[PDB]
Design a protein around this ligand. Sequence first.
Ligand code: CLA
Ligand code: CLA
Ligand SMILES: CCCCCCCCCCCCCCCC(=O)OC[C@H](CO[C@@H]1O[C@H](CS(=O)(=O)O)[C@@H](O)[C@H](O)[C@H]1O)OC(=O)CCCCCCCCCCCCCCC
Ligand SMILES: CC(=O)O[C@H]1CC(C)(C)C(=C=C/C(C)=C/C=C/C(C)=C/C=C/C=C(C)/C=C/C=C(\C)C(=O)C[C@@]23O[C@]2(C)C[C@@H](O)CC3(C)C)[C@](C)(O)C1
Ligand code: KC1
Ligand code: KC1
Ligand code: KC1
Lengths: 162, 179, 176, 176, 172, 227
Amino acid sequence: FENELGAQPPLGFFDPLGLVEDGNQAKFDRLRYVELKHGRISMLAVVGYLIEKAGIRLPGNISYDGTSFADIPDGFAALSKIPDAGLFQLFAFIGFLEVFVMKDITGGEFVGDFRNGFIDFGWDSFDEETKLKKRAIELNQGRAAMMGILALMVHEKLGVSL
Amino acid sequence: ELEDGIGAVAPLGYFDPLGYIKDEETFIRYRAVERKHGRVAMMAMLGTFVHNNGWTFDGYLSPSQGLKFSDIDSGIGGLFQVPPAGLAQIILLCGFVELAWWPASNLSGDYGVRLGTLNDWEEQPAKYYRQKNAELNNGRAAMMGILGTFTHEVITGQNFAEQAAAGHFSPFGDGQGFF
Amino acid sequence: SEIELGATEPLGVFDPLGWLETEPEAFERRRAVERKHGRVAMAAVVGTIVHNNHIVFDGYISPSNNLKFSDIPTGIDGIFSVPTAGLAQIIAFLGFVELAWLPASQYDGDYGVGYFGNDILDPEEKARKLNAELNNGRAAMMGIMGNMVAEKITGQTMYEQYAAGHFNPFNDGEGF
Amino acid sequence: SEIELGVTEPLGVYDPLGWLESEPEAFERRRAVERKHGRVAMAAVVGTIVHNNHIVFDGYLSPSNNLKFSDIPTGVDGIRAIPTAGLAQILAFFALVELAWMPASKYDGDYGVGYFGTDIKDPEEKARKLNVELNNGRAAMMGIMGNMVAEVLTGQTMYEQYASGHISPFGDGQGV
Amino acid sequence: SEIELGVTEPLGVYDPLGWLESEPEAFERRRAVERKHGRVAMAAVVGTIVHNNHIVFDGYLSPSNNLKFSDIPTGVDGIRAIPTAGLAQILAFFALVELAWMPASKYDGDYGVGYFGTDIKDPEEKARKLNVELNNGRAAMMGIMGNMVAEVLTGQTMYEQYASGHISPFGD
Amino acid sequence: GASPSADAWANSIESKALPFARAPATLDGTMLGDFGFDPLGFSTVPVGPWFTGIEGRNGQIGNLNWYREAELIHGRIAQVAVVGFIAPGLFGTLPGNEWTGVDAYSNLNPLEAFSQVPGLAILQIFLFMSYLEVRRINIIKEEGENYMPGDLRIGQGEGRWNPFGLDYSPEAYEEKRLQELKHCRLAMIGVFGLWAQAQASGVGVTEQIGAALTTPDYYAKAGYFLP
Ligand code: CLA
Ligand code: CLA
Ligand SMILES: CCCCCCCCCCCCCCCC(=O)OC[C@H](CO[C@@H]1O[C@H](CS(=O)(=O)O)[C@@H](O)[C@H](O)[C@H]1O)OC(=O)CCCCCCCCCCCCCCC
Ligand SMILES: CC(=O)O[C@H]1CC(C)(C)C(=C=C/C(C)=C/C=C/C(C)=C/C=C/C=C(C)/C=C/C=C(\C)C(=O)C[C@@]23O[C@]2(C)C[C@@H](O)CC3(C)C)[C@](C)(O)C1
Ligand code: KC1
Ligand code: KC1
Ligand code: KC1
């Protein structure tokens, strides 16, 4: 596991702990799957935190109930003031994504390739050099975003300005 | 039947420990009795389960004697609570089954009672051996249970609802027997 | 056979620790443990619905102790509120069932009784209900565990919690 | 060797029962029992001297029972005054010592230590101190039993017997 | 004779990670660290016993800080009560022992002192005592963690906890 | 035609325990402790290790190793339960907290002491009884047909647990097996009488024997008033 997507000009195949010092491909492609699973969530979570800290909201009225978007606080307190009828809808639809439409249904050519032949914004117009660094970008962009988003939440509960 | 091994179930096998089967013709007589006694004593055990639970019919068993269903004892004396004009009806119907409909002279015990898809013995013969052994085994356990139910009322004087209300499940320290 | 059942459509043969390729000699006992843990949890999940719906029998489970059946709590403390002479009668009978009647050293789980008595005549209608026992058994393992940890964390039983409407863990008083 | 280790000058080989050739195979456990009984009784004699000199630990043996160390009788009722949770600690520690650390089934008593951590390399000097351990063990075995029967026949501890001037036998004594 | 110095009864050779032939190269350091961690922890559980029995040095540790020996806490926070001008004095002196006098570079653990100044020349005499130093060192490592963990999970020191009768695990 | 056990009552050798009753042929003499005592003919109908599954439910012909396995485990428990019926009444009881409740371990009637001690006391005893029965089944899994009855691998011979040496001679070992079996059969009768007297008297056995081995308070002479 010397030369693939995590191998890296500052730190090539870091691996400090006792994870993959064997030839088990199935151990690696499970761990590679979750690393971009955590990265793709945390990339939207860095942006999803900093639009709430900047105070940007949807144009109002999250419910017919008389609660607007600006009434809902930012950070961990957003979870407590979202109406519970709508907080089921967030967990049910993300569950609807994570069960049904988020998958290697048809078989991609790598791990995390969830194009089932349904949606594709190109991926043919690359020169086979640019494909594997452009998903080495989103591995490392997803790498820094999950240490980014973990910093935003350890310091919200601490109260430290960032 | 001996060759299928109908009564011989897996804890004890061919449990004839005192040596009573000395040929094949006296097994068919004994199995005809054991299966018949087991069928009677199974309905006798479901009786004592229902009687001692207080589940009675509503109304009068004998309105000309004024005897309600509620004032029949749930114990060993409850059958003879019943007027003899009434249980002559029980003996005459049960005697008519024993001679005409399910003739107890039939030593095979088959009377054609088939409840079809719950016993499709022709396509699952293992279900035949399961239901044939369980008719004997539930009949043997209920034969000893009704001998249990009978003598527990005799030696204590209380029926099963009364000796379970008192917690009287030990023949030691009570005023009954020499123990 | 047995090594391909337990593997249904959304994941296939699912073993992230890889003990099928690594230790195949331990699989048929581990299937027997999975099937037994399933069948125990299925009666355990069904029991929690029946207890918390206040379906009780009547009278006293222990008249010496003056302890009714409705005096039993409907949560985790219910089997431990039963007196010790009563719990010893359960475990002695359940050990009679798990060693003599349905001996759990028999690892194919097959004890003479079929599916409602019948042997499944088809081989893959048999494999479909063999997978449905495993999948409902695996779902009930998470169901009884998800009912035990969520009682001891929220402090209330399943009737108590549902009466109170304590369903949202984000706007109550809890951790996070 | 072990057969030569118990013999000293005024008696030599001393067995009135004659079991040294009647039961020559039972000797090597019977030496280990004599050495164990001697080692136990030597600490018991020194213990009774310490208890009756009123050397106490300055504290509370069980503050739960308001039991000071000086409230414990210095005679044969000493460990009858120890609370039962206290004798459980003594029996649990010496289960670890008499079965695992210095196991009493090791029939030579040669566990890890020497004489103050020294292996006596001289065989005539090592046999001399092995004779001393047996002889001081034999003297303390008679010493602890004559201490114990003198307490129960006087009703006094060894401090009270030397307080009242009760060395002279009211019963009948036997001592050197 | 160092690969059989930790082998004793019931466990025998104990290696759940299997490092004894995963790394047969790094055993000489890893034994010397286990021996050093054992010697440090053995002088630490004895330290917690002396401190919680209120054996103090009947004077002033820092008369500049107006601080006497009985004012220092007898728990985990006793090293923090020492002023930094005084704890600099102990890392200045143990720099002299750990680099110069008995250098921890020396992976034998063997220096000019023996077992109370004596060299043990019978070879399982000596291997019995070397096993004891390791085993009492291992038991003191688990002993000094179990003292420091159980202090902070009750907040009391060992003197305070035993006086309150807080031995049985009630809250945990 | 005939029963497999009616053929064992046809040979029907002389007995020793019931010397008027002609013990059946399945008591071959080759077993430890066989004294020709089987009036109900259980040895003619031998049982197999049913706990191992359905393939072990059948019993082999002429093999009483599982009857002897149940005889030894009933008697080994019964032996240590004589002392359990006696030693709280002799050597006192154990003290209790406020957690377990005081006088929880102090019921000298041994039968309601089951219902007085905490449930965690009974559960940890049952789990320790469970652990050696897990050790038993794992021995009968491995040994199978060469499994000796009563073997928990404790003692003298092959790779068994022997922390005491216990290195008997090969026919003083069969006397220890006979001493164990005769104490097994005796203490089974003894622990039945203890269980039946504790119900019939309501107290422990030291508390019933000690009351019967004492003079009554109205019969006791005043005694020793002569100066
Ligand atoms: C209605 C009474 C009755 C009859 C006629 C039979 C007949 C038979 N049994 Mg069954 N059995 C019965 C009741 C009966 N059983 C009960 C109640 C039990 C549970 C204890 C059993 C348990 C049992 C097993 C496990 C097996 C049999 C088997 C057999 C067959 C073997 C021969 C034999 O042992 O005869 C029995 C001898 C007689 C009936 C004549 C003697 C009559 C005595 C002296 C009367 C005295 C009884 C006394 C008053 C009360 C007894 C109960 C008491 C101990 C408390 C034979 C067909 C075997 C079999 O089917 O193999 C294929 C077999 O394996 N029996
Ligand atoms: C703890 C008990 C005990 C045991 C097991 C032994 C065992 C032995 N002794 Mg030792 N001995 C003991 C206590 C014991 N001794 C005490 C207290 C004294 C001082 C009086 C001696 C004085 C002594 C001498 C001078 C010698 C021995 C020798 C021996 C060995 C000879 C083998 C033999 O045939 O002895 C006979 C068997 C026995 C001694 C064990 C039988 C135990 C008896 C039957 C118990 C009954 C005692 C009775 C109740 C005491 C009541 C009075 C008391 C309370 C005051 C044997 C290892 C000899 C030796 O070592 O040569 C190699 C030897 O020369 N013994
Ligand atoms: C081929 C044709 C076949 C036909 C078959 C038809 C059979 C019909 C079913 C027969 C069922 C069996 C009936 C048993 C009799 C019974 O129930 O007694 C009824 C009474 C009920 O009393 C009760 O006692 C009660 C007192 S108390 O309330 O419980 O305190 C009280 O409530 C109650 O009123 C009172 O009645 O019970 C007793 O008297 C106990 C009797 C003890 C056993 C009797 C032995 C019978 C003799 C045979 C001995 C062996 C013979 C060989 C030697 C020669
Ligand atoms: C604390 C306390 O006291 O407890 C409280 C707790 C709590 C939780 C608050 C309570 C509550 C309220 C609850 C739980 C309410 C839940 C109600 C529930 C469960 C409502 C089901 C609707 C499904 C429908 C209508 C299906 C349409 C289905 C249609 C139209 C189909 O065609 C289905 C289909 O399959 C077929 C038939 C035919 C197929 O060809 C096609 C498909 C496959 C599509 C209580 C009662 O207050 C008690
Ligand atoms: C063989 C026949 C039989 C008798 C005669 C009998 C009698 C009693 N049963 Mg038992 N019992 C079974 C069989 C029998 N029981 C079976 C097959 C099971 C299923 C496993 C079972 C389960 C429980 C539980 C959970 C409890 C229990 C009790 C009592 C107690 C009530 C009086 C009282 O307690 O005052 C009396 C003596 C309670 C108890 O022991 O309370 C201390 C209690 O909690 N039973
Ligand atoms: C060579 C001889 C020598 C002198 C002459 C000397 C003198 C002082 N020692 Mg030092 N000392 C050692 C040697 C010497 N010390 C050694 C071998 C060790 C162990 C490695 C050691 C350890 C500590 C600790 C823990 C503390 C300490 C202190 C003082 C302070 C007291 C006066 C005061 O403080 O008013 C005066 C200057 C305390 C302190 O510095 O408090 C600010 C303090 O806490 N010392
Ligand atoms: C064919 C239709 C039919 C009629 C018309 C009829 C009529 C009466 N039956 Mg009924 N009967 C059956 C059928 C019929 N019976 C059947 C199939 C059985 C099961 C074998 C049966 C059983 C009993 C028992 C146990 C008793 C009983 C009684 C009466 C009595 C009520 C008034 C009265 O008190 O006289 C009137 C005459 C009681 C009794 O005779 O009391 C002296 C009584 O105890 N019967």
